[PDB]
Coordinates of C-alpha atoms in Angstrom, one line a residue:
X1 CA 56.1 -34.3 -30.5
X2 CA 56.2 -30.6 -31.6
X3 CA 58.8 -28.0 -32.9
X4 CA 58.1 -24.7 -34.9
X5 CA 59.9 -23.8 -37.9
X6 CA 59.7 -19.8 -39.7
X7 CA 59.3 -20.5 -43.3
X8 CA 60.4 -17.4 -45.7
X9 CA 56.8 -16.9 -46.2
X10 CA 56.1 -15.5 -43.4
X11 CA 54.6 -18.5 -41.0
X12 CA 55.2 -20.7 -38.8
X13 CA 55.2 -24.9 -39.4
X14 CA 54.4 -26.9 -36.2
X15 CA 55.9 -30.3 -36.5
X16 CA 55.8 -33.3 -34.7
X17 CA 59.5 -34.2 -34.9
X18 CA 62.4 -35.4 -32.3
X19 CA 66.1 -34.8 -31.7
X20 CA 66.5 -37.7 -33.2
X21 CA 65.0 -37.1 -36.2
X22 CA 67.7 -36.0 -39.0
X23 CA 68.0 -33.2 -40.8
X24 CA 66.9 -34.8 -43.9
X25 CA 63.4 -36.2 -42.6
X26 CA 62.8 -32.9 -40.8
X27 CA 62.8 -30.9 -44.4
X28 CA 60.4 -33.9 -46.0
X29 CA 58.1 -33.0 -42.5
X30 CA 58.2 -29.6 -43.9
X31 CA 57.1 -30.7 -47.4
X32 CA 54.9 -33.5 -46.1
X33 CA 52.0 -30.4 -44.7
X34 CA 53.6 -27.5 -46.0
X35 CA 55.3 -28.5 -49.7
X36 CA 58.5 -27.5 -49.2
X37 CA 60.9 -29.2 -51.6
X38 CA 63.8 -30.5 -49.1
X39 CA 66.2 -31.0 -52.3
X40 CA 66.9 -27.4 -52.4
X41 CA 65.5 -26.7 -49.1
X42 CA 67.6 -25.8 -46.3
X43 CA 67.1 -25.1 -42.6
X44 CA 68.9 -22.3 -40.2
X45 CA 69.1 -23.1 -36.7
X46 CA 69.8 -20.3 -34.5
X47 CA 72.4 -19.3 -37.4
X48 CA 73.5 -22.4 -38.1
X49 CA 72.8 -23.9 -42.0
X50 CA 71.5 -27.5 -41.3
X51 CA 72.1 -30.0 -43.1
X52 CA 71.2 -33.8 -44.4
X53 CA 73.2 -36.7 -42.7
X54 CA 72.9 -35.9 -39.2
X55 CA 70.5 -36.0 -36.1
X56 CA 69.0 -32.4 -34.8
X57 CA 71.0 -33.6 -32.2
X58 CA 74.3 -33.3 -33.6
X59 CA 73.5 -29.3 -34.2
X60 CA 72.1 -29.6 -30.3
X61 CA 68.6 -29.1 -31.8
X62 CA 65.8 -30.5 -29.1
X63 CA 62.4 -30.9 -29.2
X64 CA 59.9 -28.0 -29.3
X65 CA 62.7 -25.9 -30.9
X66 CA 62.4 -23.3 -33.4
X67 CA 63.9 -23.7 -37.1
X68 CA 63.7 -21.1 -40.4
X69 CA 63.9 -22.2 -43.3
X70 CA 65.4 -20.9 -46.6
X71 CA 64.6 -21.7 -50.2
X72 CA 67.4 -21.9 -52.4
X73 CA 64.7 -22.4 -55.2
X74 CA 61.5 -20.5 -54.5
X75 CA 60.5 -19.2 -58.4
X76 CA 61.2 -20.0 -61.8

């Protein structure tokens, strides 16, 4: 498998997820290679601010698809 997400620094996280895959384990794919901290963590699909407790597709997310994601903590 293999989806792109735009992280607010600036590049782009290929991962290897599904459809099927939730929300939830999609931000701990991002912090598995990347780091990214899903607890404050949040991805924006096509404008739309994903969130845990549902599949990608229940925000009609498929597979190769493109996700940002914004950092509600970044610094402190």
């Amino acid at each position: 498998m293999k989806i792109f997400v735009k992280t607010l620094t600036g590049k782009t996280i290929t991962l290897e997820v599904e459809p099927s895959d939730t929300i939830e384990n999609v931000k701990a794919k991002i912090q598995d290679e990347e780091g990214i901290p899903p607890d404050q963590q949040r991805l924006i699909f096509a404008g739309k601010k994903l969130e845990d407790g549902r599949t990608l597709s229940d925000y009609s997310i498929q597979k190769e698809s493109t996700l940002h994601l914004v950092l509600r903590l970044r610094g402190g």
